[PDB]
């Protein structure tokens, strides 16, 4: 099949209403991998970090797998749409597409 990428676990689609927090995550099997989050082909989520979007990076010692998390808190209707996760590393390449729905 397709070559083994960085993600042991690919991000999964989720839906949350106004004022609701939603967490999206991806894990990478293992120096530390670098993770970028996008709201499309050319939009970077890190530059958009604020009241409704947070970023967090963690490492799991037992599986020596890196966890990348996208934190959305108090999600609003304007956040309904398509979000894209892109991760690039020294030896592996992969990305994924997910959708978030928030209502009024």
């Amino acid at each position: 099949d397709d070559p083994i990428g960085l993600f042991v676990m690919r991000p999964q689609d989720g839906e949350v209403t106004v004022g609701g927090s939603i967490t999206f995550s991806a894990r990478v099997a293992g120096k530390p991998p670098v993770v970028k989050w996008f709201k499309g082909k050319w939009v970077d989520l890190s530059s958009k970090v604020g009241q409704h979007l947070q970023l967090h990076d963690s490492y799991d010692r037992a599986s020596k797998v890196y966890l990348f998390e996208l934190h959305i808190t108090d999600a609003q209707p304007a956040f309904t749409g398509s979000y894209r996760c892109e991760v690039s590393t020294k030896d592996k390449f992969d990305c994924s597409n997910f959708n978030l729905t928030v209502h009024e």
């Binding site: 120096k31 670098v34 690039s88 590393t89 020294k90």
Partner: protein, 370 residues
């Protein structure tokens, strides 16, 4: 024996003639406390001199006695000399002639004043002032070649043929590692880190000495710095602050190669070496290219010899091979040359006697030596 002192920019190298390595190596700096100190029981040591200052660098406002090969304040220099004679050396100035090494095309006042202080402030039977390019050549062990000497202060090129010198052929360049440090501090500010004090000024210089290196191709590394992985390293300050640098480290050494970033018309180090060669006689040019010797503090970064070789080979004719010799510890080569120079039997006759000074006058230094 004999005493050899190197009064270069930022560092004072002292030792004994005939020795392969100097006894005393320490920065030539005096640090004083700019800000009032808060604590109980402190000796409040007003003045710090030497390597002690390096440890307590953040609080202290460091001052360099020597700027561009010129000493701004004479008393600080005396403290440095005193420190070298009675601390690590543990010897009296009276005991031996003292050899000082000076860079090419240096101003007249520096040689006359330097000798005057050595004859008057530290009493010695005789002293001699040497030239860095010739001394470096001796360390090399080669009779003929072209010597590019780049110190912490001013880069100089001095070609030599079987012992005969060409003063017209010697070229002085105003690009040096200290200049790079100022450019470097200036470049850091755009990123978001700012250093505006002399004490933290050394911190960027420290970063430059081991972290910085020279790229095979400047444009390609910048291109690949977008996805930097091994291009970024973390530097730990004594203060406790953490610094992360990327493409920034290799573009600094680049400036000597590419003065354009600096904003100056003058050509880079490889072009200047070429210019010195052009000045020299056409017949002796052919072995000048294959006998190139690198020396000084700013030639330490890896890959310099390899970049210079390809650039000299492409610009120069392909009819002859281009060889560059860049031995390690070339920074200390100038001091080493001083110790070896004082070790020759012929040389002892050549020292400037006290009697000659008294009769003829201070201006005889240029007359007696180059």
């Amino acid at each position: 024996a004999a005493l050899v002192i190197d009064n270069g920019s930022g560092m004072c190298k002292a030792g004994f003639a005939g020795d392969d390595a100097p006894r005393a190596v320490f920065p030539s700096i005096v640090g004083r406390p700019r800000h009032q100190g808060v604590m109980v029981g402190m000796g409040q040591k007003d003045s710090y001199v030497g390597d002690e200052a390096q440890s307590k660098r953040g609080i202290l406002t460091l001052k360099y006695p020597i700027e561009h090969g010129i000493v701004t304040n004479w008393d600080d220099m005396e403290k440095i000399w005193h420190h070298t004679f009675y601390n690590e050396l543990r010897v009296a100035p009276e005991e031996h002639p003292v050899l000082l090494t000076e860079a090419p095309l240096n101003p007249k006042a520096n040689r006359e004043k330097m000798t005057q202080i050595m004859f008057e402030t530290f009493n010695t039977p005789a002293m001699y002032v040497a030239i860095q390019a010739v001394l470096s050549l001796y360390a090399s062990g080669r009779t003929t070649g072209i010597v590019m000497d780049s110190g912490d202060g001013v880069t100089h090129t001095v070609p030599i043929y079987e012992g005969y010198a060409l003063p017209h052929a010697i070229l002085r360049l105003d690009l040096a590692g200290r200049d790079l440090t100022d450019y470097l501090m200036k470049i850091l500010t755009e990123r978001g880190y700012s250093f505006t004090t002399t004490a933290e000024r050394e911190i960027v210089r420290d970063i430059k000495e081991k972290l910085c290196y020279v790229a095979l191709d400047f444009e390609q590394e910048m291109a690949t710095a977008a996805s930097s992985s091994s291009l970024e390293k973390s530097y730990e300050l004594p203060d406790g602050q953490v610094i992360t640098i990327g493409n920034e480290r290799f573009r600094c050494p680049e400036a000597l190669f590419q003065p354009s970033f600096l904003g100056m018309e003058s050509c880079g180090i490889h072009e200047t070496t070429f210019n010195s060669i052009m000045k020299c006689d056409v017949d002796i040019r052919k072995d000048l290219y294959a006998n190139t010797v690198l020396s000084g503090g700013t030639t330490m970064y890896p890959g310099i010899a390899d970049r210079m070789q390809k650039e000299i080979t492409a610009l120069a004719p392909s009819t002859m091979k281009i060889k560059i010799i860049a031995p390690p510890e070339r920074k200390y080569s100038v001091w080493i040359g001083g110790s070896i120079l004082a070790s020759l039997s012929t040389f002892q006759q050549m020292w400037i006697s006290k009697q000659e000074y008294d009769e003829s006058g201070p201006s005889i230094v240029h007359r007696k030596c180059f």
